[PDB]
Swiss-Prot record, chains A, B, C, D:
Organism, scientific name: Homo sapiens
Protein name: Pannexin-1
Ion transport as UniProt keyword: yes
UniProt-annotated glycosylation sites, renumbered to this chain: 226
Binding partners and assembly: Homoheptameric.
Amino acid sequence: AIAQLATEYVFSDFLLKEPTEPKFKGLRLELAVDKMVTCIAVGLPLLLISLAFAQEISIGTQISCFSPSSFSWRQAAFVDSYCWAAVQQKNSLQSESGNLPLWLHKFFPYILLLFAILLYLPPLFWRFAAAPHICSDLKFIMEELDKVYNRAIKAAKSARDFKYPIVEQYLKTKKNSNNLIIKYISCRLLTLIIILLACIYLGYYFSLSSLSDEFVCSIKSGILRNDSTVPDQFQCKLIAVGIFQLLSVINLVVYVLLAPVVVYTLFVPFRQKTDVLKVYEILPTFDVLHFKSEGYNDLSLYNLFLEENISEVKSYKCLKVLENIKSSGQGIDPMLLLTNLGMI
Amino acid sequence: AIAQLATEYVFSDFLLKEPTEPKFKGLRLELAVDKMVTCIAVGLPLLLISLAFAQEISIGTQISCFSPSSFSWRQAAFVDSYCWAAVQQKNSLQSESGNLPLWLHKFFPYILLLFAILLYLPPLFWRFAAAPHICSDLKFIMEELDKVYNRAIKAAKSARDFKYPIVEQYLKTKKNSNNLIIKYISCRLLTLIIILLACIYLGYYFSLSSLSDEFVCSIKSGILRNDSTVPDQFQCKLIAVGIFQLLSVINLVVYVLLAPVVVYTLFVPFRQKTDVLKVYEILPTFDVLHFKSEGYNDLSLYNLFLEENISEVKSYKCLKVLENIKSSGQGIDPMLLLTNLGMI
Amino acid sequence: AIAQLATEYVFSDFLLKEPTEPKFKGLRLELAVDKMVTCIAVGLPLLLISLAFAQEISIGTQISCFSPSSFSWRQAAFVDSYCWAAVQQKNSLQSESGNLPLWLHKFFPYILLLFAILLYLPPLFWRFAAAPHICSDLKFIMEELDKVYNRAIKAAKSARDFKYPIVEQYLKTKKNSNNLIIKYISCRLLTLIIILLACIYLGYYFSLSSLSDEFVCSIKSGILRNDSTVPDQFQCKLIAVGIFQLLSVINLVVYVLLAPVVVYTLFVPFRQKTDVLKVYEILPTFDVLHFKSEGYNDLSLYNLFLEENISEVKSYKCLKVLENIKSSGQGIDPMLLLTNLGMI
Amino acid sequence: AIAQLATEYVFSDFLLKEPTEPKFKGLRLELAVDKMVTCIAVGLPLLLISLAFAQEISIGTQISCFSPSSFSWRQAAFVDSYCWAAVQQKNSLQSESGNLPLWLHKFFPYILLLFAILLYLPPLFWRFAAAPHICSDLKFIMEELDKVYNRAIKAAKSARDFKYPIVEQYLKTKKNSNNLIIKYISCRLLTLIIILLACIYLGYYFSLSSLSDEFVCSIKSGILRNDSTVPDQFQCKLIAVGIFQLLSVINLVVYVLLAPVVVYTLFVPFRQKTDVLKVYEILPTFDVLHFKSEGYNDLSLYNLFLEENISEVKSYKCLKVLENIKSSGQGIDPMLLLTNLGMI
Ligand SMILES: CC(C)CCC[C@@H](C)[C@H]1CC[C@H]2[C@@H]3CC=C4C[C@@H](O)CC[C@]4(C)[C@H]3CC[C@]12C
Ligand SMILES: CC(C)CCC[C@@H](C)[C@H]1CC[C@H]2[C@@H]3CC=C4C[C@@H](O)CC[C@]4(C)[C@H]3CC[C@]12C
Ligand SMILES: CC(C)CCC[C@@H](C)[C@H]1CC[C@H]2[C@@H]3CC=C4C[C@@H](O)CC[C@]4(C)[C@H]3CC[C@]12C
Ligand SMILES: CC(C)CCC[C@@H](C)[C@H]1CC[C@H]2[C@@H]3CC=C4C[C@@H](O)CC[C@]4(C)[C@H]3CC[C@]12C
Ligand SMILES: CC(C)CCC[C@@H](C)[C@H]1CC[C@H]2[C@@H]3CC=C4C[C@@H](O)CC[C@]4(C)[C@H]3CC[C@]12C
Ligand SMILES: CC(C)CCC[C@@H](C)[C@H]1CC[C@H]2[C@@H]3CC=C4C[C@@H](O)CC[C@]4(C)[C@H]3CC[C@]12C
Ligand SMILES: CC(C)CCC[C@@H](C)[C@H]1CC[C@H]2[C@@H]3CC=C4C[C@@H](O)CC[C@]4(C)[C@H]3CC[C@]12C
Ligand SMILES: CC(C)CCC[C@@H](C)[C@H]1CC[C@H]2[C@@H]3CC=C4C[C@@H](O)CC[C@]4(C)[C@H]3CC[C@]12C
Ligand SMILES: *[C@@H]1O[C@H](CO)[C@@H](O)[C@H](O)[C@H]1NC(C)=O
Ligand SMILES: *[C@@H]1O[C@H](CO)[C@@H](O)[C@H](O)[C@H]1NC(C)=O
Ligand SMILES: *[C@@H]1O[C@H](CO)[C@@H](O)[C@H](O)[C@H]1NC(C)=O
Ligand SMILES: *[C@@H]1O[C@H](CO)[C@@H](O)[C@H](O)[C@H]1NC(C)=O
């Protein structure tokens, strides 16, 4: 039913499932905006496919040819099925709009499924190629941040009663390499191109005259070519073509609204803001150097992933509340850190 | 529905399920490229089979023979079913394209299922014959790497405050044996041959005239042979043949795009690059000798499997970050290793 | 659907499920070749049964008798159902090929299910009679091997810083008894005989003229015997008989390919090779005596089961890597064993 | 589908499910032969019921009466349904074989279900009445055996470096009481009687002329009794009667093969062999007295249950391997027991 389709595709965790494995425990591995874009671009065409053939919206068979009254039920059924299979056969049918509109009307669900698969492909390539590496690197970075926070609080407590910036060096090294950012931009660009092509196709499909679904059909090949009792042609109409056009314009609207989001996603350096690591600069055990901005490198992408999935880090949360309290400046950062006692 | 089939076969973990057993905990046991190739080559023909008979794309019955108006519904049904069963019986039907096109049109789903099964067979043979051995060997290798890393860090800590290369000897011994690599190449080659045969068949099927689905049928055997009221022949058409041809060309395109991937897979030594063990050479407890390249031996395959599923090793990750930091050369490898404190 | 059947029967763990109980944790209890043979011989006929009546391959009802035009729909339905039930009644129908072909055409699914059940019976008898005993014995043997390995490594460590061969005596005693091997050979032989009988039946079924599905039917018993308006006979055809013959020849090919595998399985002593226990002979705590070969006794079967499910034993894996390293001979077996430190 | 029914009823754990409760952890509570007999006798008739009405074997409706051509579809449907309901009404129909064959043809599924339920009743009575008691007693016996084995090995170890036979006294007391064995024999005898009655019924059903399914039907009661346009009688045939007879003879064959098994089961004392407790007689802490044989008492049944579910006992397994080694006599039983070190 329509409501069942809605529950499956919008109100359920459709493509929102976290990786089912212990390797990525709590790691999104995909930005929220990218996940939203993929979920829409994939589950919208599927939802429209399901809707267009819902038991309520669908009168019945997808084509009716209006055989003569003399024709029996199965003769008329032969006519309808023959014309359905003959939309491909150009000789059989003669339609003013041509045969491409008939092909599109017959295979619209296939085309929507193709667009959905093509849009799901780049996210899958990301999740299967560049996701494990970033997952491991980000897990190491979070562990290093937790360890340095613990060491700093232990030092502060000892004072009240190595020291090498490994994480900073690793981030600096990531500043050079760009394979991950190149893959990310390539997959986003392919998604954008697929969306644009889908928009072109949907606009063309919705621009039809709405009468191209009606085509003339001739069961006059073979032994029936010279038969007399059979009329030379029939009036066939492809039902649900109006529904297809409505859903196609809906998908076109959604995709044109979505494309600016993908374009904004492509410009990762601009998105790289609100320095996540700036909060850690007040730790004595952490060097006061952010050095993450203004670069078409994997460093900006790692900064984005950190700003996305750093809320799970207790040390980061503690430092964030310390920073927020520092806005008033009533107290002192080391005193607040010592009082917090948030090692684990 | 179409969307349900898509969710099952592309958006779900179809053939992507990890081995459901404690023996292989986190071990892929199959390269990512090989898994992708198998998943496509298997779940594409199944998806096309499901699509070709979807409740929306399917007008109804798969053949209609256009019985005379005088014929009753069940007489016409007898005609249609008789011709459906008589596509095999050459005498009954007379078609310009022959009888092989009719056989193919009737049994296209069976042929796609056969290709899917034949393509799934070599992966299954691998997973049931050569997977347990490589799993055990690779688990031992990872355990040995973890143990040697722990011993090296313990030695470094003791200095700050046996020694036999068992793993290196085991890898060197693997350099000689080649049964695993021979099995891998044989299964990949069989997959490639099956893909090529499927491409040949799909090209032949799509090259049909598109009118071979229309065949002349004669229910004139037995007591009806000399009956007069029955016409000497009927005009039967195999519905969904156009859909079969469309999906067959789609599968042909996918398989021709996939075959280069399989050929590239066959050349494992070329794939053997980015030495995974090179990072471990900086450990005092590990001998400085990689000795893994340029060989049609199981050593290259083991190197590939390591480069695939070594990200799960904390010691390997730590050594990798140490290597990446060494690019700048600001610090020292032993000092960084001591500061890391990543025993477990 | 066809794809659903494929997923259930070939791509899923159909009859590949491990024993659902804590008694056999990780124990196959069935050789890989035997499991493959049983899985094929059982799930192939079931798959063919499901395929032959798939919603796509099936035109509709399994028999159509072509009642006269004057006959109403339910009169024709009576004719068809009567002939379907009268394939058994020899007097009612008169077919050139006889009545056995009609019986076979009607009950082919039943015959395939019968063959599947008969082929599944010997494996079930094995798993319910001789599996618990071998499971317990093999678990004891693995525990003894682990314990002796632990004792030997402890002795080596003590030197660096009872002694009775219970397992060897148990294996020697198993050398005498042969009930398990006799049961194994009997079940394999029964499976082979069932496969041969199935091949005979399928060859006979596929050798039919292909026109035996068309039989003459007479609803002329009872009050209708002397009725005039009803024709003396009808032309009935059993639909799906061609599909049955195709699937029967497929099953015949599979079974003839499989029978050599079963024959090879029957010769267990030849299969008994690559001595698993030879690796343990280098342990000081283990006597240097294999004494397992060239016998129609349960010892060979136990050797096969060990070679099958010994990879799960850490001590065996360690000894195997020690053996492989010994190929070069660079080091020493006791030194390598001491350095391994693989007690648990 | 047929394959689905097979998977449910033969290839699945149909009635093979262990008690879903912590009270019986690993205790069969039912002998293997009895479980096999019950599973067959119950799931065979159910499987045949499902098969006889499978979507493939079933042409359609279960009765067709061949109404005149003048009759409309729903008039013919009224005729068919009336005759279906009138098989009971003797006046309406006049059949040569009588009315009992028609009753049986109509209610064969009900009769098979009745036999299945009646055969499942005694096993259920056992499992709900006499199973908890034997479970508790056998769990106590196994615990006592484990404790005495532990005490004996501890004594042997102490020597190398109460004593009352509670279990033997309990078994001796069980030698007197016979309520459990009486219940077991009664349930087995009732199962045998039900099987014999089912065989009688199936033989009678299969001995029919095969034409009793065709009966004459008269819709001539009420206002239609003196109606003229309606014929005085119709020719009705009960479809699937041949399938019923085939499946009934199959069930008859299975049950006649099974009855000897039940008779052999009834003679429990003969089955009481291969003394399970004989292995424990070599323990110093266990008295050398078996005293379990030649009795129509619960002791023999307890011996059977022990021989069935004693493999799960580590002490029993250890003593069994000691016994098997004693066949050669090379070593000594106490020395082997001390060396085993199998307390837990
Ligand atoms: C997904 C991508 C490939 C879709 C591409 C656009 C498709 C949907 C449409 C939009 C405009 C269309 C074209 C418009 C006009 C013509 C001229 C005609 O004489 C032949 C077909 C041809 C050349 C059409 C082919 C299909 C077309 C290119
Ligand atoms: C992503 C955004 C830009 C998509 C907006 C939809 C645009 C591309 C659509 C809307 C209307 C469409 C046009 C409608 C009609 C025709 C006439 C036909 O003979 C050729 C294609 C052509 C000229 C279409 C080309 C594509 C089109 C201009
Ligand atoms: C999967 C593999 C086996 C498929 C092999 C190719 C199949 C699909 C096709 C492609 C070309 C075909 C052949 C083309 C021409 C002829 C000549 C004709 O007089 C008999 C059939 C025969 C000999 C065909 C047999 C089937 C064929 C070989
Ligand atoms: C894997 C790649 C190479 C597959 C590409 C598809 C090729 C092999 C296909 C496409 C068109 C096909 C041809 C189309 C028509 C015919 C004529 C027929 O009488 C014999 C087969 C023959 C000659 C086919 C042979 C196979 C063919 C050449
Ligand atoms: C599974 C086993 C039992 C199958 C045995 C073979 C079956 C399928 C077939 C193969 C050959 C067949 C026989 C061939 C010829 C004849 C002669 C005829 O006048 C009576 C039937 C009889 C005697 C057939 C009986 C059934 C038969 C034996
Ligand atoms: C396991 C292997 C050997 C099976 C190979 C199939 C063999 C046994 C098949 C293939 C063709 C079959 C024959 C085909 C036709 C007939 C004629 C009939 O009147 C009697 C049976 C007989 C003679 C069949 C006997 C069995 C047969 C020879
Ligand atoms: C499950 C048990 C109760 C089944 C008992 C046997 C049933 C199936 C059958 C087998 C033989 C049958 C009897 C055979 C002959 C006659 C004589 C007739 O004039 C009245 C019915 C009567 C008396 C039948 C009654 C039903 C009967 C007893
Ligand atoms: C468990 C074993 C013994 C069952 C074997 C089936 C036996 C009991 C079957 C097979 C054929 C049957 C007979 C077939 C025909 C008739 C004639 C009828 O007027 C009375 C019942 C009677 C006489 C049946 C009695 C039961 C019968 C003898
Ligand atoms: C139909 O009849 C016409 C008459 O002109 C003839 O040309 C043509 O070949 C016939 N077609 C068939 C299929 O027999
Ligand atoms: C049909 O009638 C023809 C007349 O020539 C005859 O040859 C043939 O045998 C008959 N067929 C049947 C099946 O009776
Ligand atoms: C049908 O009529 C014939 C005429 O010869 C007669 O012999 C036969 O008994 C009748 N059959 C029935 C069932 O009344
Ligand atoms: C039918 O008509 C007959 C004429 O003899 C009469 O006896 C009978 O009562 C009538 N039945 C009904 C139900 O009116």
